[model samples]
Target: GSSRMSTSSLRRQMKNIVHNYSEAEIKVREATSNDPWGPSSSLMSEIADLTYNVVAFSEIMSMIWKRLNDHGKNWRHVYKAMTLMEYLIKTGSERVSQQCKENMYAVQTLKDFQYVDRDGKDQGVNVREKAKQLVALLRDEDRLREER
Candidate 1:
């Protein structure tokens, strides 16, 4: 079997995809912050596929994991990011599975979100749980067993 892209290339492309997504997010937020008319649902859905061509949304997740892991920062964004990737990989094909296997290290660095309950509200519940679930997905032997 042959891998279409090298791991190094994947890393490079992942970084670019993540960076572009961040910029796009910022622009979209700024554009919509005060506008009563937000982007249409159709528009949003279309925009969502910006990174799904070769890499797929799961690939973007892999990139996010890699970026966050390398920086050890932005725990805030890890939850949804991992959740998306997990969903894709869970329902993905061999290509998607291979993407996960190659960029698997990104998911490996995820840890339980640190929680400090000041007002007796369990703030970290959702984020923590999502991170846990993502980790569990990555660590699940059965789902990715063949890749091992």
Candidate 2:
């Protein structure tokens, strides 16, 4: 609430977050069309660089939360979003981890976020496990915030 910015700039920044995140998500979805192994080979470094510059940290967490909630969501996109979450939690601001902590509702979804692929292979266990690790990380971050 105390942040300083004009409405026009804020509006443009939000549009940029939507535009850039959505386009990067397509890369995630396509790469994971076959498997979650996609996270290893491709890094959305450019997206991250741009995201840190434009989007508010809290809004970035919400965007990931949105991806996790899609009724038409697939395991591929889910895993990819989780991957992004992990990256942000580690590489971005402490506010990123705190935002994930703040959005505990979506964080809980990771426990049951499993699915089967077209080849009948089940996925999301890894994502969910990573979620636990991420949850732990974020939990610790909240403690850090408290200490501050």
Candidate 3:
């Protein structure tokens, strides 16, 4: 029975196909399939963490400006200096009740802001949107997953 390289070759090919299919199935299940609880019980929580970080930094900026004004520096013509260090320290510490004066003495420029631009917009990526996309990747649902 010399039909298409005999029965032995066919069996070998079938074995390889089955083996490859099983391997692929296992990988897919681990990567894409969810637990018995499905998607409800399983969710990405990194979004909240990202939100908190951004909010904290924004507040820090505000505190820095306020402390500078408190020293009678007069926002109109202050050279971004910290002549009144004591007044600035009164605002911030390790807690939220006070803002850190260190920010006033520190001038922040976005010269390298382009480096963090994950969205490649030539400006800067939205931190909130980027964080959401990141969480979705961890859950393995960030992009097209269906087979053609």
Candidate 4:
């Protein structure tokens, strides 16, 4: 049955999930065969075309962060992290760029206190709690900071 989820409960679950998965390793598997070094110049340029898309996504994320922050929700902190992520994706290289790839990973991996249950079912006042979880799954530590 659907029921209200208190703020305390949301926070606790979020913290717990973070604690469990925060240190989980991202393992690498041995390849059956060697792979190419990277994309060709033309393909690199095409992929670089994603810069605009990254910026647009970041803007949308910023809006969400602002809304949550206005409510004094600690979740805003997670959005702040997103804000950092966006900066990396937008300004960083899109071609055969290691930094850009790192940024992409960071944003996609949830590294914070976002309680993301796999079933995606929640009966609570704040569904954002689950949202936060997914966000954590998307976060990465290899942040990109650019100079002004």
Candidate 5:
């Protein structure tokens, strides 16, 4: 072992990213504009780079799934999360697909996800479809094959 990660360098960066994740959650939760173009956004570029860094990928995902379960009651939140996951699974490292398959709660949440607005209309048209796609991607071997 030549060196270690306890020099406060990584810890500090994790803090910044963790905070950054939540900040994006708020924007997602409250967003009124179109989805970011093809999963590359100002809010995403920094975190997107973390996909190659296994530990950082896990850390960022932990926060995202936490927010996903927090009952944000908005389609944008789940929409952003689902779209981002697809990008990561298909474009990020193989570990990204592996890490996602092992995250059972996430799979379940996507499987059971739905939202209806007060007007008796659907809220997450794209979000639920994306969620459905992710459920299969993580569970079915054939579907999973294309992701990596």
Candidate 6:
């Protein structure tokens, strides 16, 4: 069972996670800067698995969702945030799933954003499209859970 914490506290914790992960990411990249290859799965997993509690992970993501909506900052950060949401849906607990379901509107907002490509070939990355994919994945997971 989950004992829900204050949203402000959750946001604080989420900010801490982002700050710490940013530092960790920089260190990992610095370590691999000389090498041609990227960081290994073992290393990535080690960093990604820093938070084991499903409820806390959900809270972190929910905070990220709120940030994305409020600031509408960098698209790259939004992409990373959606990736975390997808990861939670795929590998999180029942409580995590429920939390994600509760926050689906935020994901939908990301998907609803207008993405324009001035170039004919659409050379640039589509952040909104990625968010749409994440929304579909979340709904799919929810559907599967309902089916079970």
lDDT of 3 by residue, 13-110 (tens): 33344321122222222222233444443121221121234443343334333432322222211122122112222232223212222331232221
Please list the residue runs of candidate 4 whose C-alpha ends up more than 4 Å from where it truly belongs after superposition.
1-73, 92-97, 111-113, 116-148
TM-score of candidate 2 against the unseen true structure: 0.53
User: Model 5, residue 17: displacement in angstroms?
Assistant: 15
Q: Which stretches in model 1 have alpha-carbon errors above 4 Å?
A: 1-52, 55-59, 66-74, 91-93, 113-122, 142-148
Question: Which candidate leads the pack in TM-score?
Answer: 5
Q: Per-residue lDDT for 28-139 in model 5, tens only?
A: 2222234444443454544445666656666555555654553526656566666556565666557767777787567467556775654667655666567778767777
Judged by lDDT relative to the true structure, which candidate is superior, 2 or 3? 2
Clashes of each: 0, 0, 3, 15, 0, 0
Cα displacement (angstroms), candidate 4, residue 6, comes to 68
Q: How would you order the candidates by TM-score, starting with the best? A: 5, 2, 6, 1, 4, 3
How well does model 5 score by local distance difference test? 0.57
Question: Local distance difference test, per candidate?
Answer: 0.46, 0.57, 0.28, 0.34, 0.57, 0.51
Ranking by lDDT: 2, 5, 6, 1, 4, 3
Worst 10 residues of 3 by lDDT: 76-85
What residue runs in model 6 are displaced by over 4 Å at the alpha carbon?
Answer: 1-55, 70-73, 115-125, 141-148
Q: TM per model? A: 0.42, 0.53, 0.17, 0.23, 0.56, 0.50
Per-residue lDDT tens digits for candidate 6, residues 39-106, read 55443233235224533454455545644453333355566556555554555444545766676677
Q: 127, model 1: CA deviation in Å? A: 2.7
**Cα displacement (Å) at residue 10, model 5:** 30
lDDT of 2 by residue, 1-148 (tens): 3787556544333333444443444442343234435455455443344346445444455566666654423644566677767776667556666667667657767766665645565555766776666677667554333433
Candidate 1, 1-148: lDDT as tens digits:
2867555534333334444343333322222232356545442232234334453444444454543433323344555455445554555333544566676555554554454543454454455566556556656665444543
Over 4 Å off, model 5: 1-46, 70-72, 117-119, 138-148
